Amino acid sequence: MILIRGLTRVITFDDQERELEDADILIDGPKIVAVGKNLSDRSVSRTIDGRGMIALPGLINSHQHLYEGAMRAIPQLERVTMASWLEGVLTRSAGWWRDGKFGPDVIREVARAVLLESLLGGITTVADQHPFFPGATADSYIDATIEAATDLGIRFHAVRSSMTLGKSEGGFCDDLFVEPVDRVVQHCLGLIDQYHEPEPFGMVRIALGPCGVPYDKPELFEAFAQMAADYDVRLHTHFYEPLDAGMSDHLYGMTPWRFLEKHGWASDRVWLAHAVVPPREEIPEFADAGVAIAHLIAPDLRMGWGLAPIREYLDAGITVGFGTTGSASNDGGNLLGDLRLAALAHRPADPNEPEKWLSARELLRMATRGSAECLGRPDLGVLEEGRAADIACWRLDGVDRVGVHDPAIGLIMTGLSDRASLVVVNGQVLVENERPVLADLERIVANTTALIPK
Template identity: 35%
Template structure:
């Protein structure tokens, strides 16, 4: 048995608002109440707050290769979408680019305390090796020691081709997985069209059938500005009306963004059992809206937190976006407390993936955790060190990160790869 003990923390955030002191014991990759500590590896957490590994509930890892592109900032989404599509076409999206972009995005994630990333991949050139593209993201995660939930998305794809591709990806990557999750819990497969602004009813139907056959989670984007506008123009209906009619409101569905939702729609979402993902680091700077998170939570809708991709949010730093979520929440309702937003970035995001084993540090949970040093001047005078994780020191990085009990970041540096090599290879591939 492999045993790791994390000892000496200022505070340990177990689950939601439950905070304690004492050891965290991980045996064979899982949190346990106790174990034989003979020969155990001891990780010194002195001066640190220990949290579960953060879970990024909505990312587009491919976009890590397309950050700060001229002409893609602060523009209407109708203009942003074709600008990004042109950039993808110029770069030629293939398994190699997917691998290199995912390596960079996942390395950034680990270095900022994110241990699980939901990667909604939406770019599938005609005739592409779609299994190879999915395998690229999975390989990047495996090499770095991160968890990834790879979402076989669609954005104006042929519906039949998208469904055939999704079947092939499940068969190739998680052939024996239960609910699309590999036996070790490190890889998950899900499906999801980009949204009703992009994909027809047939795409939703066929990907939904793949999900039902394999017990996969379903994910899509809804009620950003362009989504509402195009749905009204094309169908004379709002996006959630269409998703309900098309069978895409249910407990296995997660909806990202939800910036423009009415009280009636919130009630319908709550009744359907869907989960939601807030992405303020994308929606706020681009001017696409602010989700009414307080109202969603009060209605009983579980809400996670995501960064979205580098094409709209040039950073993949989930804790920084958690701070932003607190700040902008006061624009659309009562301000969200730090403890609640931290829960969104951990258990809330994990619940949207159907993964009660993630985002928590309770017995049976995965041994994914972060050590956040709160002993420096950036935290001087902080009365609540857990709240200070979000309010103080914007952009802070963890001292150490463990995934399944394995140290993948130590003293702020990647253990599993060379950061410089990751950066150089991606720049070489995109020739910038």
Template identity: 35%
Template structure:
């Protein structure tokens, strides 16, 4: 049974219902669970690990609800700079087709470490491209090694150029394979407990890279396991035009028509 004491903080921001800010304060943690928050004099005198936060501010960890850790490796490609979304993707898809298990693992180590150094303690990642030997397992391993609270989502792309989608066919997957692997990842890694450090989500990439059938089946699978659903939505005007042409709906209407709304769904972007 391990304990941690943070004491003597010049200011502790609780973010509780009263938004209290405490001076000369700290917190006491047992087995990775915060048991007490208050002034230093009201906390236990010692613990297995003691941090003297004198002159510092203590605040809750930041939460990142959408990330693409594998893109850490391609964020400085000159041809992709200042491009709109569709052109940016078309530039990078051929590079991402070379992703390997090692690349996914290393990019997750780098990206998650950067987040942790910036004060982020919980992060969700949306990995939706699985060429070569890449698997979601590779970034989960990185998260476990770093100790961040991680919400990896098993993304997917099944609608390639030959079917009217945006991504090249070679970076898409068969829908039955997607669903089988999603089930495998949930059964292997998802921990639904209250203080879980790893919860897996289901995350078809976007309206322009998966079929309506995959959206429906992914939603059904997620509900059967009680896991959350995630996708990109209403990210650009190009996406809105695509949805109107292909489905007769604007993006949010399209998502709602497929049952992709509710308190167990979160959308990324939503700017158009």
């Protein structure tokens, strides 16, 4: 077993929200054996010195687009609404793919770099989707991302994405980029059969992810609702982005939420991205249905969308998680850094009611337990006996963190760097001293850089 000893602070996010000081975490294989003071090192093969660190559950990124790693900091996409952004991302991925520059060898290596960045930022589980890569499926994209994740040892959920409603039938998508519904459904059945690991501590899982109400056919939503029931997998889609209420009313004469109810998606199998602008009246309905919501602050701001009613969701008892989205709308995979954006950006909306503002601890919970719940993982997101040994630790003794009174608030509110010190996934140490212990960082950077489309 592995013992991390003398951690300065341990934040568990267990049912009592217990935190500990100068405490240990004991690990046996995939699972946490104990969390407490002065644990025995009896059957321990190795003791890691945790002194001067804060430990959390591994961060869980509820929303990536790994292929967008190749699309960072493009000047033409710096300041663009949603429509210009979407057009520019789609045409680039289509152009690159057609030209032969975005094949599975390329996607695998882009995924490897972004997933390694993820580990380095304390992220132990990533859920990747590919809504804005039309050729994704013809490109064996998911096979490649899973190979990269498996190689690195990061816990991984692959969301099979699509755009099945063409521009001719009113889709914001356009006919070029559109697969037949049966094609999507068939492929999804195959991926579940091949890759899904439904057991506790499973390291790869498949989810089903139409891009959204404006982008996919109702028949696809209904197909996936049946499939999720029959195979016990989760459902994901984007939700209440600013143009959606109007597009939904025009196509279907109902709100996005009523559409979801009609087509089987008002259930506890579902997590929803963004949720920026729902009608307030529907919020209690979200809660009763048991849907989960992922807060994605960075793209909400980047696209000019604004502030999701996160306080209201928490008030309602709705599960709230956290994500970065892809690097074409972030443009990094730094989940911890993005928490600070949310911590600050929500405040001016309630200038005289600071009790409404999201707190550091609320935000860290979103990035761990809340995201775990989004992905339907009761085995993750919590440091307690019996959960998975997915752990992220940051040093507190840097010169940029002198004077910090509360280390949890400190993680969000201070620092020159969000680099994790020690990262464990599935009981394997993958980062120590801010550096990968199994992956060759320099070689990956070189290999991936030579493959970025130019």
